[PDB]
Design a binder for this molecule. Structure first.
Ligand SMILES: [Mg+2]
Ligand SMILES: [Mg+2]
Ligand SMILES: [Mg+2]
Ligand SMILES: [Mg+2]
Ligand SMILES: [Mg+2]
Ligand SMILES: [Mg+2]
Ligand SMILES: [Mg+2]
Ligand SMILES: [Mg+2]
Ligand SMILES: [Mg+2]
Ligand SMILES: [Mg+2]
Ligand SMILES: [Mg+2]
Ligand SMILES: [Mg+2]
Ligand SMILES: [Mg+2]
Ligand SMILES: [Mg+2]
Ligand SMILES: [Mg+2]
Ligand SMILES: [Mg+2]
Ligand SMILES: [Mg+2]
Ligand SMILES: [Mg+2]
Ligand SMILES: [Mg+2]
Ligand SMILES: [Mg+2]
Ligand SMILES: [Mg+2]
Ligand SMILES: [Mg+2]
Ligand SMILES: [Mg+2]
Ligand SMILES: [Mg+2]
Ligand SMILES: [Mg+2]
Ligand SMILES: [Mg+2]
Ligand SMILES: [Mg+2]
Ligand SMILES: [Mg+2]
Ligand SMILES: [Mg+2]
Ligand SMILES: [Mg+2]
Ligand SMILES: [Mg+2]
Ligand SMILES: [Mg+2]
Ligand SMILES: [Mg+2]
Ligand SMILES: [Mg+2]
Ligand SMILES: [Mg+2]
Ligand SMILES: [Mg+2]
Ligand SMILES: [Mg+2]
Ligand SMILES: [Mg+2]
Ligand SMILES: [Mg+2]
Ligand SMILES: [Mg+2]
Ligand SMILES: [Mg+2]
Ligand SMILES: [Mg+2]
Ligand SMILES: [Mg+2]
Ligand SMILES: [Mg+2]
Ligand SMILES: [Mg+2]
Ligand SMILES: [Mg+2]
Ligand SMILES: [Mg+2]
Ligand SMILES: [Mg+2]
Ligand SMILES: [Mg+2]
Ligand SMILES: [Mg+2]
Ligand SMILES: [Mg+2]
Ligand SMILES: [Mg+2]
Ligand SMILES: [Mg+2]
Ligand SMILES: [Mg+2]
Ligand SMILES: [Mg+2]
Ligand SMILES: [Mg+2]
Ligand SMILES: [Mg+2]
Ligand SMILES: [Mg+2]
Ligand SMILES: [Mg+2]
Ligand SMILES: [Mg+2]
Ligand SMILES: [Mg+2]
Ligand SMILES: [Zn+2]
Lengths: 60, 83, 155, 23, 127, 97, 97, 206
RNA sequence: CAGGCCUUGACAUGCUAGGGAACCCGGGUGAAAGCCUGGGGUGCCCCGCGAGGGGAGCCCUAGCACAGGUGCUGCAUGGCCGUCGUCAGCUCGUGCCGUGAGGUGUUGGGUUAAGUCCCGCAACGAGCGCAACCCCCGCCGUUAGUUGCCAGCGGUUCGGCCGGGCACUCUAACGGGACUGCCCGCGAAAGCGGGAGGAAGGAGGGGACGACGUCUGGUCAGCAUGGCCCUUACGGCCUGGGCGACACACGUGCUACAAUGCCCACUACAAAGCGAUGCCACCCGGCAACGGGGAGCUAAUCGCAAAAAGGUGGGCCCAGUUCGGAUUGGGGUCUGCAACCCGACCCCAUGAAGCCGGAAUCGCUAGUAAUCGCGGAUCAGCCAUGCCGCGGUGAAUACG
């Protein structure tokens, strides 16, 4: 039960509660960041590539 | 519990059948999946079969069990004890 | 630690008497980093001992300290197949730490209901040579003398 | 303390308000 | 007629204005003792001038913001001691030896991942 | 008390009880067995019996391996004993001088 | 006559805060020099590995740096000339009054 | 399993982002999605060309995609045939004014993503992986690089036991921030499974 | 998991044939899904004053390929991570020694946080690590002066509010600064001990950073991927249940057992963040949760916001209590289609265990521990006492 689920997550639901974010990249339902539309893993994968504008390794 | 400003919630599809049976005179058994529906004064004396996930449990409604939810009378877990 | 002999923290002299030893005592009173509370308790105690016995609190406090200092202690050392309680002299740094520690602990075993009072009275007894604090010191010393025979195992 | 709702401290810990901690 | 110093401790910053007079001291719109009422830590703030006897010789106008009362107190201690070195250059000796003229860099160490706090580690049961 | 984990395997109360009677051999040494934990597991080669037990004089960690789950358990016990006997007697070695 | 500058890169921000402040200082009269508005930092903290290993993270941040410049004595010499200026890509400009 | 990604570690020091723009909270995600879809299409279509980097720029309703490549011609076409074909496929997806540029990769044998893909191609052709890796590194050093390191992990040669083979020459100081190191990855799909290829090229320190 | 349903199928690329495309709107049956069905107008380039004739814009219906599988194998794998370990190490080239595995270098004397550096040496170099280059913090400077600041002079509705100014604070970009550089001493040197200057001293504090490799470590359930397995079902939709069960057992935490405390009332002092079906001033109804009004703020402007410990006063008087706040009864609020299973919050009542914890065992070397509160991601709401951050207060001790 995966591709059917990345699909069902797209279609608007019968009630607005049933909506939930999936990672637009890998389809992950968990740890999905609103700001990027990405999960924690993809967030890390693209950022390391430099394909997230302004995003950089944070050190203090 | 549910805000008093809002309604006394019954799923309408359950309720409708109640009033239908009330008019003609009650009663046939009513199979419902509506655990979330309040027992309502109009329902008293009926016997509603409440699906617990597996079986439909026959529940004869009485004057004492009005304010409650339908699910409260069709328990969802089989537990006979330990050991 | 393994590499070097650590550095003794130099404390800041206390506001009311200008005393590093008082500051140290305050910190030992201090629970949960509530030093304002800690400060009051001591200074409140300093008030009390003046009322009960009109002298210099500072003089009392310092006399109580010199009375709780263990001059000799036992430290275990397992030699062969037995643990011997070896008699050792206490370094002045350590004498201080133990004295201030026992003072507060013995204070807080006392029955009267307010800390400042317990701290007051214990400092009064220890100054005169009574109280559980001095009892600790006396005992530690007696243990050491009791094992004078093992004083050659000293490192 | 912090576990008692009917007190000020309890409402702070819990991050709510009421009679025992008003705003 | 005016003399100035900048004090910082932790997150507290203090602007202090030394102006000669009888010794009245003001912190953020209130007397010293009104703002630091009930704090033993307080009178440590006036320590730099006690080192050069400027106890009663100066009034002091003082701003303070950020951090907490104690850090603010330590901040004041710094600034008024900068103000003094400013009021007289030869004040350095008999101020530097008391280290009043230096700023301690000791601040809150950052919280690290894997730990409960900065250094406090989570409890583990090996077996 | 004593915990047993059967990783990605099903076992019976019988088998669990067997392990308890087998660990029981360690009671020989009259020392406290604190939270003994047995983990049973299946590799492609055979079974694996893991155990971690703490005692007043140290920890016991051992892994037993064998095609027969019972032998795997028995070898686990053998390795645990040898460790426990060292923990209980190593201190006696240097009583002189 | 307000110009508000916002970018993810501060080299290309200060770049453009400079040039706007130059352009209108040329065709006069007064530019209120580029004031650096405090940065809004958006942090993202992630577990390094895809599965378990909770105690290991990596920190990422996204910094929106703000600049403000005020052209005080405008004179539409500036206003028209400003309409064409070579602005880098990582910067967004806002003009208001 | 340890080493930090050598590019993400150098962002804004020796290496610059590939999507350079600003966007606010309400917008960022949607631009980013479109950005990746642009890369999705182009990564498939421009592979044969020798795709190394794909820079992306944005202002307002208009976007400029700069494609770096070893074979500019394979991108552009005959007088602009494919280059035109692209804008249409592009701005259909974009739905906005999509400027497509192309730019030379002066030395493809100093471009780490290129070296990586070449070796990945070589090992899908059932070439001798170790002989290949030494070659790749030999090419990169001849082309003047200050150091090189290439790594291949997986069922090498078809073997059931996965293994990792690498080779290196000169300097590759992955710990040095100011050292410019191009990095690239290439996936080699075979009948027996996936091999991973990593290429490190040390162009020099800044 | 149970039950009700769907069969090129929730989704890709196809090729073919019927319908009209396309999109919206209702009706029946039903828990819903689904099944049933009654609505209504398709541009094009086209013979079109004419029926009529498409093409492919997209759908529909029937096919066939195919889809789909969080089914198996992390012991076939890529990727990424954990660990030993921020440990000081792991090697290569050539030469030399050995029949050979292999040695040498890399050992040795000194030194360092360090295979750090020095001296010596059949070794002479080189690489990956170490360090440095990067970020935060500490001092200072330059450039800037609003939405931030207010030293001084004017107004001052009595509030940096106004004039004004950018000094100061700050904010945020760029620089300076520490190198054992300088003196004493020991040294063959490298260094070590002490001093001064200085905001800072011997890596200034913290961060990012993790060698060759190990654990046939972890993940086929984030993703990818070989192969094996499912195909009116091991795919797909829905309603309900379950993941929240409870004789027991262990791990991590929260709150505690009280007077250095608890309660009330009044009164101070942060930082980092977050906020247009959002953050909510202020007003009014309610004991309250909250509700209804309603201004401001694309936010250094406005808002969350009150920080808490603390301070000042008053009560409690050593009791299972004015400690503790579990359990349960009753009444409400809010979110949400819906709080029975299974939400958080408020109020009334109830007011348990617990009097400091056996064997055993964890953390921490300084702004640390301890203690105090604040924010954020996720997020309709929340089971967060979790996690990642932030500042407040602020120790003890290290012989070895
Ligand atoms: Mg299924
Ligand atoms: Mg999948
Ligand atoms: Mg949701
Ligand atoms: Mg989600
Ligand atoms: Mg004590
Ligand atoms: Mg005692
Ligand atoms: Mg006596
Ligand atoms: Mg209470
Ligand atoms: Mg006072
Ligand atoms: Mg803290
Ligand atoms: Mg653990
Ligand atoms: Mg068990
Ligand atoms: Mg199981
Ligand atoms: Mg079992
Ligand atoms: Mg094992
Ligand atoms: Mg035996
Ligand atoms: Mg042995
Ligand atoms: Mg944890
Ligand atoms: Mg593995
Ligand atoms: Mg792997
Ligand atoms: Mg496994
Ligand atoms: Mg030989
Ligand atoms: Mg030979
Ligand atoms: Mg050799
Ligand atoms: Mg050799
Ligand atoms: Mg070696
Ligand atoms: Mg060797
Ligand atoms: Mg040596
Ligand atoms: Mg080291
Ligand atoms: Mg070296
Ligand atoms: Mg040598
Ligand atoms: Mg700062
Ligand atoms: Mg200036
Ligand atoms: Mg030194
Ligand atoms: Mg390093
Ligand atoms: Mg395994
Ligand atoms: Mg998979
Ligand atoms: Mg697979
Ligand atoms: Mg085959
Ligand atoms: Mg369901
Ligand atoms: Mg459920
Ligand atoms: Mg669960
Ligand atoms: Mg049991
Ligand atoms: Mg227990
Ligand atoms: Mg907890
Ligand atoms: Mg516990
Ligand atoms: Mg009691
Ligand atoms: Mg009771
Ligand atoms: Mg009891
Ligand atoms: Mg009570
Ligand atoms: Mg109730
Ligand atoms: Mg519920
Ligand atoms: Mg205890
Ligand atoms: Mg306690
Ligand atoms: Mg014990
Ligand atoms: Mg340490
Ligand atoms: Mg407390
Ligand atoms: Mg919080
Ligand atoms: Mg939030
Ligand atoms: Mg939330
Ligand atoms: Mg609950
Ligand atoms: Zn993802």
């Amino acid at each position: 039960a995966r591709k059917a689920l990345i699909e069902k997550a797209k279609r608007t639901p019968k009630f607005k509660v049933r909506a939930y974010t999936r990672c637009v990249r890998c389809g992950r339902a968990r740890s999905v960041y609103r700001f990027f539309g990405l999960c924690r893993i993809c967030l890390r994968e693209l950022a390391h590539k430099g394909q997230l504008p302004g995003v950089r390794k944070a050190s203090w | 519990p549910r805000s008093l400003k809002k309604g006394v919630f019954v799923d309408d599809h359950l309720l409708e059948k109640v009033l239908e049976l009330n008019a003609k005179g009650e009663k046939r058994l009513i199979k419902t999946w509506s655990r979330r529906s309040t027992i309502v004064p109009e329902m008293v004396g009926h016997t509603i079969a409440v699906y617990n996930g597996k079986q439909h449990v026959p529940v004869y409604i009485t004057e004492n069990m009005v304010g409650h939810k339908l699910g409260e009378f069709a328990p969802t877990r089989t537990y006979r004890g330990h050991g | 630690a393994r590499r070097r002999r650590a550095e003794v923290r130099q404390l800041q002299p206390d506001l009311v008497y200008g005393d590093v030893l008082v500051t140290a005592f305050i910190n030992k009173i201090m629970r949960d980093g509530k030093k304002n509370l800690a400060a009051r308790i001591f200074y409140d105690a300093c008030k009390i001992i003046q009322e009960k016995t009109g002298q210099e609190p500072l003089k009392v406090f310092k006399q109580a300290v010199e009375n709780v200092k263990p001059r000799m202690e036992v430290r275990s050392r397992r030699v062969g197949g037995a643990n011997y309680q070896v008699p050792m002299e206490v370094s002045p740094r350590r004498q201080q730490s133990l004295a201030l520690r026992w003072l507060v602990q013995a204070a807080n075993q006392r029955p009267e209901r307010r800390a400042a009072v317990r701290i007051a009275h214990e400092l009064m007894d220890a100054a005169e040579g009574k109280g559980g604090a001095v009892k600790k010191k006396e005992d530690v010393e007696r243990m050491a003398e009791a094992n004078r025979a093992y004083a050659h195992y000293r490192w | 303390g912090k576990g008692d709702r009917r007190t000020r401290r309890g409402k702070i810990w819990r991050g709510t308000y009421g009679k025992y901690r008003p705003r | 007629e005016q003399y100035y110093g900048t004090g910082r401790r932790k997150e507290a910053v203090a602007r202090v204005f030394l102006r000669p007079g009888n010794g009245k001291v003001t912190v953020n719109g209130q007397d010293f003792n009104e703002y630091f009422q009930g704090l033993v830590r307080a009178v440590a703030a006036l320590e730099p001038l006690r080192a050069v006897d400027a106890l009663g010789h100066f009034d002091a106008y003082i701003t303070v913001r950020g951090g907490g009362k104690s850090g603010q107190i330590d901040a004041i201690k710094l600034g008024i001691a900068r103000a003094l070195v400013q009021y007289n250059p030869d004040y350095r000796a008999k101020l530097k030896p008391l280290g009043f003229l230096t700023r301690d860099a000791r601040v809150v160490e950052r919280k690290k991942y894997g730990k409960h706090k900065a250094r406090r580690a989570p409890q583990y049961s090996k077996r | 008390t004593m915990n047993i984990t059967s990783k990605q395997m099903e076992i019976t109360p019988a088998i669990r009880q067997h392990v308890a009677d087998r660990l029981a051999k360690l009671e020989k040494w009259q020392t406290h067995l604190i939270n003994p934990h047995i983990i049973l597991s299946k590799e492609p080669q055979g079974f694996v019996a893991d155990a971690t037990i703490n005692t007043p004089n140290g920890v016991l960690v051992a892994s037993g391996k064998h095609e027969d789950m019972y032998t795997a358990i028995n070898e686990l016990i053998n390795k645990l004993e040898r460790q426990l006997n060292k923990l209980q007697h190593k201190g006696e070695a240097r009583r002189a001088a | 006559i307000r110009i508000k500058l916002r970018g993810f890169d501060h080299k290309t921000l200060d770049a453009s805060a400079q040039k706007i402040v130059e352009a209108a200082r040329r065709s006069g009269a007064q530019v209120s020099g580029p004031i650096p508005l405090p940065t809004r930092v958006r942090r993202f903290t992630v577990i390094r590995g895809p599965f378990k290993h909770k105690d290991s993270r990596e920190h990422f941040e996204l910094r929106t740096h703000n600049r403000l410049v005020d052209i005080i004595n405008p004179n539409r010499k500036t206003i028209e000339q400003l309409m064409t200026l070579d602005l880098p890509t990582g910067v967004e400009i806002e003009i208001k009054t | 399993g340890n080493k930090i990604h050598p590019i993400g570690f150098r962002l804004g020091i020796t290496r610059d982002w590939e999507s350079r723009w600003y966007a606010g909270k309400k917008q960022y995600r949607h631009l980013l999605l479109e950005d990746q879809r642009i890369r999705g299409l182009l990564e498939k279509e421009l592979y044969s060309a020798g795709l190394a980097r794909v820079d992306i720029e944005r202002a307002a309703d208009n976007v400029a995609v700069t494609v770096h490549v070893a074979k500019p011609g394979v991108v552009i076409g005959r007088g602009g045939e494919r280059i035109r074909v692209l804008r249409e496929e592009l701005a259909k997806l974009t739905g906005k004014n999509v400027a497509l540029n192309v730019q030379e990769v002066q030395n493809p044998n100093l471009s780490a993503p290129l070296v990586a893909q070449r070796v990945a191609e070589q090992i899908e052709r059932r070439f001798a992986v170790r002989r290949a890796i030494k070659q790749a590194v030999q090419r990169v050093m001849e082309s003047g690089a200050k150091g090189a390191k290439v790594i291949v992990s997986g069922r090498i040669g078809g073997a059931e036991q996965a293994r990792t083979e690498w080779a290196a020459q000169g300097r590759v100081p992955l710990h040095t921030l100011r050292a410019n190191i191009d990095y690239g990855f290439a996936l080699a799909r075979t009948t027996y499974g996936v091999l991973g290829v990593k290429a490190y090229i040390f162009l020099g320190e800044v």
